[PDB]
């Protein structure tokens, strides 16, 4: 212990390494050179094995840079020449990138395996309960600080200061109350084609003796491009995504998703104005969370054996029934109408609703029947919602009655 500089100047380097290891309680109990023999061919073999992967990594990385820079990379349609290069751009560059990094790693692994010595280092642990001095004086210091400070004698100061502490926490926490909102406010608007925010409403609520609301089918229309000397720009002024429908457009055993389409935002048929931009509102009605309804036309043979729900007697209009597309379990669109078994199916968790037994569940997690929409033809022969849903559609929440 306490080595002078003279002895360290008299000590050999391997002995100094032993001293350094021993100072940290680690003993190198075994250490042997990999290639002791001088002219050993095995060293040549190891060098070749390492350099092979090294040159593979070099060419892999150069190939990456070449592929990244020069390989064609822009999009090509199905019918385009040069589709092959585009569909190999990312695969080729990633192939060679991974080859570069993987081969560099392999080279380093082989170098440590074949060249660096084997080792068995043994190190003692210093863990478990602390030595009795340190752990007895550390409680002495803490108690001494706590008692030379006189907090433990003063109850009023401690109580008031704890009050101030909880008050500081609470005021640091009340701006976090900016996020808190009442779920049952109508979000300050008369009513929209998406309702008034609250879970009690939808677009079809506009039919509560206010507005004429058609059943609008989705035409999936994109915006249309227009280009001239001023430049290419996209227009939705002459198109409409939602469109009205007559009762002779479905065949028997057929389905169509319809959305609420107020009379004001209709630009089809005889009323079609080529310069009326209704696309934004119609798309704003499509994207309502809870207003897509499956309109189902049944066969006559299957419409005989329908069971009506108490209170929903007159909602159908002949063969036509109209259920809500939003599943009553967790709210995925149901959308899988089996045309023969007459079971509306939800793909998310495999709920099955009997379309003939007023949409009552028959399989899966769902416990509650799909709500039904009353429908009727208008004066002109399109289909309209003859009323509002009588039951809150969508998933159940805590305060929903039944």
């Amino acid at each position: 212990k306490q080595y002078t500089t003279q002895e360290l100047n008299a000590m050999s380097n391997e002995d100094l390494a032993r001293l350094g290891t021993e100072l940290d309680d680690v003993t190198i109990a075994y250490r042997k050179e990999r290639f002791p023999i001088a002219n050993d061919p095995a060293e040549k073999r190891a060098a070749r094995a390492v350099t092979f992967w090294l040159v593979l990594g070099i060419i892999g990385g150069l190939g990456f840079l070449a592929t990244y820079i020069f390989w064609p990379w822009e999009y090509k349609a199905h019918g385009d020449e040069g589709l092959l290069a585009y569909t190999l751009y990312t695969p080729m560059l990633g192939i060679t990138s991974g080859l570069c990094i993987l081969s560099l790693g392999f080279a380093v692994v082989l170098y440590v395996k074949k060249f660096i010595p084997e080792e068995i280092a043994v190190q003692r642990r210093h863990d478990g309960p602390s030595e009795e001095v340190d752990r007895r004086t550390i409680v002495a210091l803490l108690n001494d600080s706590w008692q030379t400070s006189t907090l433990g004698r003063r109850k009023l100061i401690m109580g008031l200061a704890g009050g101030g502490a909880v008050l500081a926490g609470l005021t640091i926490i009340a701006p976090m109350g900016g996020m808190i909102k009442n779920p049952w406010n109508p979000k300050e608007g008369p009513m929209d084609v998406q309702g008034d925010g609250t879970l009690w409403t939808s677009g079809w609520t506009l039919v509560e003796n206010d507005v004429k609301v058609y059943l609008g089918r989705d035409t999936a229309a994109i915006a249309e491009s227009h280009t001239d000397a001023t430049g290419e720009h996209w227009s939705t002024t002459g198109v409409s995504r939602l469109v009205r429908m007559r009762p002779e457009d479905l065949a028997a055993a057929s389905m169509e998703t319809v959305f609420p389409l107020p009379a004001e935002m209709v630009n089809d048929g005889a009323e079609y104005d080529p310069a009326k931009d209704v696309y934004e509102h119609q798309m704003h009605s499509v994207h309502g969370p809870r207003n897509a309804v499956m309109l189902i036309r049944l066969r006559t043979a299957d419409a005989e054996k329908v069971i009506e729900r108490e209170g929903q007697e007159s909602f159908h209009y002949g063969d036509y029934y109209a259920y809500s597309k939003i599943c009553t379990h967790i709210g995925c669109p149901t959308s899988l109408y089996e045309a023969q078994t007459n079971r509306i199916l939800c793909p998310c968790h495999q709920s099955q609703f009997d379309a003939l037994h007023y949409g009552k569940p028959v399989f899966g997690p769902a416990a509650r029947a799909l709500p039904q929409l009353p429908i009727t033809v208008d004066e002109e022969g399109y289909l309209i919602a003859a009323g509002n849903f009588i039951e809150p559609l969508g998933p159940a929440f805590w305060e929903r009655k039944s």
Binding site: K32, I37, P91, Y111, S225, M283, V286, I330, P365, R368
Partner: protein, 534 residues
């Protein structure tokens, strides 16, 4: 060289000479299990960096635009700004697709690496005292890593992500006092909400990465402070570590395995497509696909919702939906995992300061419960994926749901039974070798005609000519003669020809001399342990 000047200048100021010496001389064991965790760490590194590259292009806004980018098959389609910018990453940026796929594959590798690392910790018993804190930290990590990854793939606002977001919102609203309030708090209103994707974006890029980074730093710091556990073996005790020092021979291997994982990710990121959003279309709440499951690490919590038998309560003006019970079940499942070492304590009846690991065969109850939980989790996973499973392997979809339901009871029991008996059989084989020696497989006929198999003893032999049994020690017992060296090559050289005979003989002599020297040092170390234990 001037390197000495740099080192001098450093240490004359910071005096690090004592400390860095102690750091480089720390010893780490070399088992193959003991770098599974490193895989997760490397994946996390890649997750960070590739994520930072994706943020220079992604725009987390739910407000719409008419698309006019490079992906021609969606020109004119009105889509969210999130989806449009994800498409521009995929098509308009050189190599953005490569990066996006690497980020996603890194997420999957990260989660599965955490899972397998945790399985190692559970089976080998490394969670025991004093290291249970690392368990409590680690379980939190593997929860948050999933929570992040879920909202990570929710951001592009494509059709397959928004259905999972819909599911999350609809589960939150169903909670039996505060569900509507909690939903309005989290989303800022009804779903979909204007502030939704920006809250999730900041939660994904800043909050949960910051927490994961802090917890991982604390985790690795704790593992370094109290030194790594080890398996029982020659010369090993509860009070020492046997392995290699952290440099040169360990740090280089850590770098090399980092390189291997990194390059593996860069390969599989360019060669396999993942989450091809361009053919899913933008989200709108009226549309859905048959196969619309969440990410793989979320399939368990999907499968729970698939197997719950629709039990729903109605109380006058109120209702508890049927999805509250899966919340209770999954919470119980998470609680059990979080609090495991203490319910291990209360029934195992010990609180000792273990530093040596248990082989999983020697602890049949815990390993049987682990395989039981594995089959439970796997049944939840495949029930989550049963829509695809029934479509591909042609088993009826109802039959798959009922397989999930009845299997989550029955299959765990079968797993426990088989696992327990197999573990007992394994340790019986170990004892059989230790009390009779290795069965070479050489069969010889005696003059009496008796067929005998020569057994090769490990310990000394009694004067009757038969081994004396050794006490089992928890270290692996060799079971064949090729694992004692008896099949090693006598020739030396490369392919196509030998080394010269002088080199051959001298090299083999040095090899055998080292083989006896290491045996001698381990034997003396073990005898020193015996003496030092009394």
């Amino acid at each position: 060289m001037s390197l000495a000047t740099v080192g001098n200048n450093l240490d004359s100021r910071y005096t690090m000479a004592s400390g860095i010496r102690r750091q480089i001389n720390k010893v780490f064991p070399t088992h193959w299990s003991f770098m599974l965790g490193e895989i997760a760490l490397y994946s996390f590194i890649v997750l960070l960096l590739t994520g930072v590259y994706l943020t220079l292009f992604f725009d987390p806004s739910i407000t719409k635009v008419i698309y006019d980018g490079g992906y021609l098959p969606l020109n004119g389609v009105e889509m969210s700004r999130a989806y449009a910018t994800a498409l521009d990453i995929s098509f308009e940026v050189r190599g953005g697709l490569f990066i996006r796929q690497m980020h996603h594959w890194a997420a999957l590798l990260f989660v599965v690496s955490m899972l397998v690392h945790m399985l190692r910790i559970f089976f080998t018993g490394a969670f025991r005292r004093p290291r249970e804190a690392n368990w409590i930290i680690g379980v939190v990590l593997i929860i948050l890593g999933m929570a992040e990854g879920f909202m990570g793939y929710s951001l592009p606002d494509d059709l397959l992500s928004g259905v999972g977001l819909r599911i999350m919102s609809a589960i939150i609203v169903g909670l039996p006092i505060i569900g509507t309030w909690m939903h309005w708090l989290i989303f800022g209103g009804d779903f979909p909400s204007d502030l939704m994707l920006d809250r999730f974006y900041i939660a994904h890029v800043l909050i949960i990465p910051a927490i994961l980074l802090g917890l991982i730093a604390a985790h690795l710091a704790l593992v370094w402070y109290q030194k790594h556990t080890q398996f029982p073996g020659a010369g090993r005790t509860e009070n020492n570590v046997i392995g290699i020092r952290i440099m040169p021979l360990f740090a280089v291997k850590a770098v090399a395995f980092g390189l291997i994982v990194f390059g593996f990710l860069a390969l599989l990121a360019g060669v396999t497509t993942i989450n091809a959003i361009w053919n899913l279309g933008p989200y709108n709440p009226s549309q859905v696909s048959a196969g619309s499951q969440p990410d793989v690490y979320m399939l368990w919590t999907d499968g729970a919702a698939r197997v719950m038998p629709a039990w729903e309560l109605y109380l006058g003006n109120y209702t508890i939906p049927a999805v509250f019970w899966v919340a209770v079940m999954l919470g119980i499942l998470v609680v059990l995992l979080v609090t495991y070492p203490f319910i291990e304590r209360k029934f195992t009846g010990d609180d000792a300061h273990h530093n040596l690991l248990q082989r999983p065969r020697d602890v049949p109850v815990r390993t049987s419960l682990g395989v039981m939980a594995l089959v439970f989790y796997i049944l939840l996973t495949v029930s989550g994926g049963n829509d695809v499973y029934a479509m591909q392997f042609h088993v009826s979809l109802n039959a798959m749901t009922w397989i999930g339901r009845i299997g989550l009871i029955v299959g765990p029991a079968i797993a426990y039974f088989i696992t327990y008996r197999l573990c007992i059989g394994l340790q019986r084989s170990d004892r059989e070798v230790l009390e009779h020696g290795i069965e070479t497989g050489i069969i010889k006929q005696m003059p009496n005609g008796a067929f005998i198999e020569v057994h090769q003893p490990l310990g000394p032999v009694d004067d009757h000519g038969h081994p004396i049994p050794l006490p089992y020690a928890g270290a692996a017992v060799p079971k064949q003669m090729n694992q004692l060296g008896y099949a090693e090559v006598e020739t030396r050289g490369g392919f196509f020809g030998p080394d010269p005979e002088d080199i051959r003989a001298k090299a083999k002599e040095i090899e055998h001399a080292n083989h006896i020297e290491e045996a001698n040092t381990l034997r003396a170390l073990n005898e020193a342990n015996i003496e030092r234990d009394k």
